[PDB]
Amino acid sequence: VNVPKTRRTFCKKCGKHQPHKVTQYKKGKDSLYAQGKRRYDRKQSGYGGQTKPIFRKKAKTTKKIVLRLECVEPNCRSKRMLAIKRCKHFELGGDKKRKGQVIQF
Template structure:
């Protein structure tokens, strides 16, 4: 887990200037157990050989506090 500041001053396209942005961490939705990719991944993971695919690194969402826009930028911490 990476320590990330709760707010960050960065450029807002809507306001046209640097504003404080609320920083939140990306959260993934619930996986379907029977999706084709999941079935393939489970088959590939079984047995010897260790981790077969790269591990997903969490992304950050930034919301401008002033106009309260939807999440803007996504970047790695």
């Protein structure tokens, strides 16, 4: 799918529709000091081998896409997360299609 790089939508901080700029959200790197990672790392220490399961099935083909949008107001710059359906190909700000066009030459 194609979605524009900017769109007006409800901004929760200022409580009215404001221009937002969207960008594809990306998962950050693991903290290595979160409680779950701290617990898992302690578990893996010593003998006994691998202690927690490894998924290795991978039935899904695509991913749900999350758009990280923040309001362009300079005073408040709150960033919200909005999700769209599954899509194999995701394009940000692609060129708008036209109907009255020759397809093809």
